[PDB]
Design a protein around this motif. Sequence first.
Motif, mmCIF file in Angstrom:
data_model
loop_
_atom_site.group_PDB
_atom_site.id
_atom_site.type_symbol
_atom_site.label_atom_id
_atom_site.label_comp_id
_atom_site.label_asym_id
_atom_site.label_seq_id
_atom_site.Cartn_x
_atom_site.Cartn_y
_atom_site.Cartn_z
ATOM 1 N N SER A 48 0.828 -1.195 0.000
ATOM 2 C CA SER A 48 0.000 0.000 0.000
ATOM 3 C C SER A 48 0.871 1.257 0.000
ATOM 4 N N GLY A 49 0.223 2.397 -0.209
ATOM 5 C CA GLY A 49 0.933 3.651 -0.354
ATOM 6 C C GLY A 49 1.454 4.198 0.962
ATOM 7 N N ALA A 50 2.201 5.294 0.847
ATOM 8 C CA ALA A 50 2.831 5.910 2.006
ATOM 9 C C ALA A 50 1.791 6.576 2.901
ATOM 10 N N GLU A 51 2.127 6.682 4.186
ATOM 11 C CA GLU A 51 1.229 7.220 5.196
ATOM 12 C C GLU A 51 1.963 8.235 6.060
ATOM 13 N N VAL A 52 1.224 9.243 6.513
ATOM 14 C CA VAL A 52 1.722 10.248 7.446
ATOM 15 C C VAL A 52 0.810 10.203 8.663
ATOM 16 N N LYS A 53 1.359 9.801 9.804
ATOM 17 C CA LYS A 53 0.577 9.594 11.012
ATOM 18 C C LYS A 53 1.125 10.444 12.150
ATOM 19 N N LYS A 54 0.256 10.719 13.118
ATOM 20 C CA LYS A 54 0.609 11.409 14.347
ATOM 21 C C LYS A 54 1.032 10.400 15.409
ATOM 22 N N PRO A 55 1.880 10.803 16.355
ATOM 23 C CA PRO A 55 2.248 9.886 17.441
ATOM 24 C C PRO A 55 1.034 9.514 18.279
ATOM 25 N N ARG A 99 5.218 6.008 17.701
ATOM 26 C CA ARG A 99 6.100 7.075 18.142
ATOM 27 C C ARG A 99 6.951 7.520 16.963
ATOM 28 N N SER A 100 7.563 8.698 17.099
ATOM 29 C CA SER A 100 8.430 9.200 16.036
ATOM 30 C C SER A 100 9.549 8.217 15.722
ATOM 31 N N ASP A 101 9.923 7.383 16.696
ATOM 32 C CA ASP A 101 10.912 6.332 16.497
ATOM 33 C C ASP A 101 10.473 5.288 15.477
ATOM 34 N N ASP A 102 9.197 5.264 15.095
ATOM 35 C CA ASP A 102 8.693 4.277 14.151
ATOM 36 C C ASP A 102 8.715 4.764 12.706
ATOM 37 N N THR A 103 9.185 5.985 12.457
ATOM 38 C CA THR A 103 9.310 6.486 11.093
ATOM 39 C C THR A 103 10.308 5.639 10.314
ATOM 40 N N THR A 155 5.627 8.012 8.163
ATOM 41 C CA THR A 155 6.236 9.145 8.847
ATOM 42 C C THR A 155 5.423 9.474 10.090
ATOM 43 N N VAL A 156 6.062 9.384 11.251
ATOM 44 C CA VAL A 156 5.464 9.770 12.523
ATOM 45 C C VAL A 156 6.218 10.996 13.018
ATOM 46 N N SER A 157 5.562 12.153 12.982
ATOM 47 C CA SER A 157 6.168 13.404 13.410
ATOM 48 C C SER A 157 5.214 14.153 14.328
ATOM 49 N N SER A 158 5.778 14.820 15.329
ATOM 50 C CA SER A 158 5.027 15.679 16.225
ATOM 51 C C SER A 158 5.219 17.135 15.810
ATOM 52 N N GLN A 159 4.609 18.041 16.568
ATOM 53 C CA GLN A 159 4.736 19.465 16.295
ATOM 54 C C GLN A 159 5.999 20.005 16.955
ATOM 55 N N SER A 160 6.712 20.858 16.225
ATOM 56 C CA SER A 160 7.950 21.444 16.709
ATOM 57 C C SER A 160 7.668 22.791 17.368
ATOM 58 N N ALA A 161 8.715 23.395 17.935
ATOM 59 C CA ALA A 161 8.563 24.712 18.544
ATOM 60 C C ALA A 161 8.229 25.769 17.497
ATOM 61 N N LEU A 162 8.810 25.654 16.306
ATOM 62 C CA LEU A 162 8.459 26.490 15.166
ATOM 63 C C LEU A 162 7.749 25.635 14.126
ATOM 64 N N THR A 163 6.768 26.221 13.444
ATOM 65 C CA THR A 163 5.911 25.488 12.519
ATOM 66 C C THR A 163 6.219 25.898 11.085
ATOM 67 N N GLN A 164 6.591 24.925 10.262
ATOM 68 C CA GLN A 164 6.806 25.082 8.835
ATOM 69 C C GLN A 164 5.882 24.140 8.075
ATOM 70 N N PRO A 165 5.618 24.413 6.798
ATOM 71 C CA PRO A 165 4.902 23.427 5.980
ATOM 72 C C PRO A 165 5.736 22.165 5.819
ATOM 73 N N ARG A 166 5.051 21.019 5.766
ATOM 74 C CA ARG A 166 5.756 19.747 5.648
ATOM 75 C C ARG A 166 6.554 19.679 4.353
ATOM 76 N N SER A 167 5.964 20.127 3.248
ATOM 77 C CA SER A 167 6.648 20.061 1.967
ATOM 78 C C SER A 167 6.086 21.123 1.037
ATOM 79 N N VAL A 168 6.933 21.570 0.114
ATOM 80 C CA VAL A 168 6.553 22.515 -0.927
ATOM 81 C C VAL A 168 7.144 22.020 -2.239
#
Lengths: 239, 240
Positions: free
Chosen positions: B7-14, B87-91, B124-137
Amino acid sequence: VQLVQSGAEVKKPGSSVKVSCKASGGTFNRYTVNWVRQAPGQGLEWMGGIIPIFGTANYAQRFQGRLTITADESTSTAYMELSSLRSDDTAVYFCARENLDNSGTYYYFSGWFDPWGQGTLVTVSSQSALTQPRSVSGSPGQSVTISCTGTSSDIGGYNFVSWYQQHPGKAPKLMIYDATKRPSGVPDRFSGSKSGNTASLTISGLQAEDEADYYCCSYAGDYTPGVVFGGGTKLTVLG
Amino acid sequence: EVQLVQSGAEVKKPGSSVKVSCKASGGTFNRYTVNWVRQAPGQGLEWMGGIIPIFGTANYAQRFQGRLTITADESTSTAYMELSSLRSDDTAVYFCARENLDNSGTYYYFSGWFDPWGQGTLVTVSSQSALTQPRSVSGSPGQSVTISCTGTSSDIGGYNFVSWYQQHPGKAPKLMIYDATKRPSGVPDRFSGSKSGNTASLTISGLQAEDEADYYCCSYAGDYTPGVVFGGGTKLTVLG
């Protein structure tokens, strides 16, 4: 100025690790050293910095109590120590310099990071991957040998050993099974051998297409049946 | 021959779970076992577990027990992998691999080697950082792109110490912008920076293929909190 860091590290959870960062430029007191880590597929995270002139070091709030950063001006080398390691500490650790001439002597650890070290990989895992050399380089036509050795437990005669080749962006592909046997299609330039605790893969008549990552693999041979891979060897062919 | 499609790629929250599938195009599913091996970006391979479709039994590595289950549907010749409490360790990239099966009646033994393999699935398992950027452009050659970076009034909003870093795969970050607007030596004038309120911006004009990389914003974290904070990073793709 070049920043050189110590080699990659393999540690078990609960222990500590020392990473060094030696500078090639003089006037060691002129700069400050920062440590920034990056987990696989993750973003950068500031850990702490040190100012050789003031003898001062600051750490992030989550590393206070487990992190200490030192520096020795006689060797112009900076050090970091992370204790009580765990799996989420697996990351590439970078050292980065801050020039105090241009940035001033007050606003230190402000983010004017230049230059950078090459990075130091630290892997922490309860399961121990078999030991392989991190990288091997060769010229076309030459031969290279890649060893595979048990780390926490030994490899023995009861262990089934396999070798896999992996090109960037592709799935791994079986090179050698049963330690010495080549599957359908694989040329005899690839050969394997096993003796006691060590298994080896030999690639003769190197070709540019052989540039890839190589993984050994062990199946069974212990009281809990399972599969364990090697850490991987990056093979470069210098055309 | 038999090809394993995932199956295709996934972007998940912790804290959530994820299910990856692995369908076989041909062959009989009952005469093989299906294993799952994952690979963190830039890292080695790691065996997670395997299933024997006939027995309906799955075995898992120690560190995954309680979070990993592997199932199969013999009707569609599809094997499934579910990883819980992410967890982010599962990316990592997740592969399915087939293993040969043989028996003598009641005793079944395995070959020990894996072939063939699936193409791999990125999670990809990623949380929110102190500064917020778009994931990709994404941009085309010649066009302009702007990467924003948002923080609070005690970092970007209270100081001018905003810096931008470019990172190519396998390399260390390289400084592109410091002091919100200044370019270091050797950085082309196509890169420019600005700051307004609690938001900083990096603009790249005349986009070139070499600009495809990861970009991170970085800010002084205030006087009361010494050090810097980083944004989560933005993957910039140049569509040639």
